[PDB]
């Protein structure tokens, strides 16, 4: 059990310079505008984690592309730049790519089946290339918003389908399985999934909106959680998605100290 | 005098064919075709239309592709394919003798909340890109006001002027989304405003809705009051086309009836 940083957090050595002088076991770099795992940002990353040890997940661009998209040339155009980030990682001796299901069009709202397939179509895709590349999809639960797709176990199946692979499994993410439902009760469920729950973010909310709240400040039992973790065995990292540095490492203490509590149980 | 036109997607997402050969049965003046899916302005496509276009004399307005595009993204390559997208439709548009096309502002996504000023920068350079293009073309822009959804560009007539800034192009004006305007405030006050962007008011889409949803009702099922639509339209002297956007036929049919025996109506005001 290992605890990250998500870059979220601005450019990229303005937030990792910062990020580094504390104690976080991996850092979860955001495939994104500055952040984007350029040929520049390969370079100056692959030096940091030689300076420092510490592991490196990556998080695929998101924003303005749907792997769900009936317009096949978006679809294209995501595949293309998830490609960018299995690469990066690749190079980055990464392991994980956590990867987020599309939604539905305001235009095709009364086809989700096909959206559906479209989604399928594009992650089999991807987790091709994840497999050529020996990189792991992490596909990510989604907040409770109209129209996007994963946000229930049930959801991430209907895209997950049949595919059969080493290479696909699922980033947990507590923060959206709070604005669902009881996020103790994904961790059985997500788990049943390809190859499991292999990378998890953490921050709080009211169950309502995906607040990325410090740690505490939400209603989320956080105890419970890391217990049903402990359970399977989720040997990974949990990765923290905060507003500001120091919130996340507020966050961090706050983790490490429930870790604390839940370890001395088993006795 | 004003022009009435039905959009193609009362029947998407059936072929163009089947979609057409039921639609020319009716009498309309206009027809809108949206450049999505299986209606994409393909050679197939543009070339069914043409034959058909001159069996029945009826005019052309195209609406660009919108859909998983976004004109305002961060995302150099989603702008350009954008782009991409929409010069198919000028394209389309231009052999098909259309004198306008349809185009959606932008969207604001949550991961750039905090960059709004460079978002508006981004739908900018889009339109300008855009523009150039239809003027290549002897193309009308007419950019669309959009439902009132939180992230969307374009709500108001000030959010559509942070797009167009300082654009001075006989070839960039506004079509006139009654329905969204409603989901934002009073329709008929939305006409004066938008007149006043770039050429003004060259298209105009009609449809219901009780204020808040983007419904897409027949005339009379929402609360929209068009006379006063129509009035404050006949008072700029709009001559274009009114396209009605409806999920069928039947309301497409009456909502034309309807809208005709409004605009008789509004006649009869100027006494
Ligand atoms: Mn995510
Ligand atoms: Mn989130
Ligand atoms: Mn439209
Ligand atoms: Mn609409």
């Given at each position: 059990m290992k605890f990250g940083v998500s870059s979220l957090v601005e450019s990229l050595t303005s937030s990792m310079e910062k990020i580094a002088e504390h104690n976080f076991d991996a850092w979860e770099i955001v495939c994104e505008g500055t952040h984007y795992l350029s040929p520049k940002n390969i370079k100056y990353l692959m030096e940091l984690r030689?300076?420092?040890?510490?592991?490196?997940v990556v998080h695929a661009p998101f924003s303005d592309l749907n792997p769900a998209s009936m317009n096949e040339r978006v679809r294209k155009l995501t595949v293309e730049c998830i490609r960018d980030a299995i690469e990066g990682a690749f190079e980055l001796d990464s392991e994980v790519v956590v990867v987020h299901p599309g939604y539905i069009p305001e235009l095709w709202s009364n086809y989700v089946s096909e959206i559906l397939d479209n989604n399928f179509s594009?992650?089999?895709?991807?987790?091709?290339?994840?497999?050529?590349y020996g990189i792991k999809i992490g596909l990510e639960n989604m907040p409770n918003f109209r129209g996007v797709l994963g946000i229930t176990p049930e959801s991430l199946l209907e895209i997950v389908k049949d595919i059969d692979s080493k290479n696909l499994g699922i980033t947990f993410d507590i923060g959206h399985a709070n604005t669902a439902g009881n996020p103790a009760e994904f961790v059985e469920k997500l788990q049943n999934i390809g190859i499991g729950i292999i990378h998890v973010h953490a921050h709080d909310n009211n169950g309502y909106d995906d607040?990325?709240?410090?740690?505490?400040?939400?209603?989320?039992?956080?105890?419970?959680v890391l217990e049903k973790l402990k359970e399977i065995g989720y040997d990974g990292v949990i990765s923290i998605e905060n507003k500001n540095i120091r919130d996340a490492v507020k966050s961090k203490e706050i983790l490490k100290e429930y870790l604390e509590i839940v370890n001395e149980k088993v006795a």
């Open positions: 030689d300076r420092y040890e510490v592991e490196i594009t992650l089999s895709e991807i987790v091709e290339i994840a497999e050529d607040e990325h709240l410090k740690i505490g400040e939400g209603n989320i039992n956080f105890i419970e």
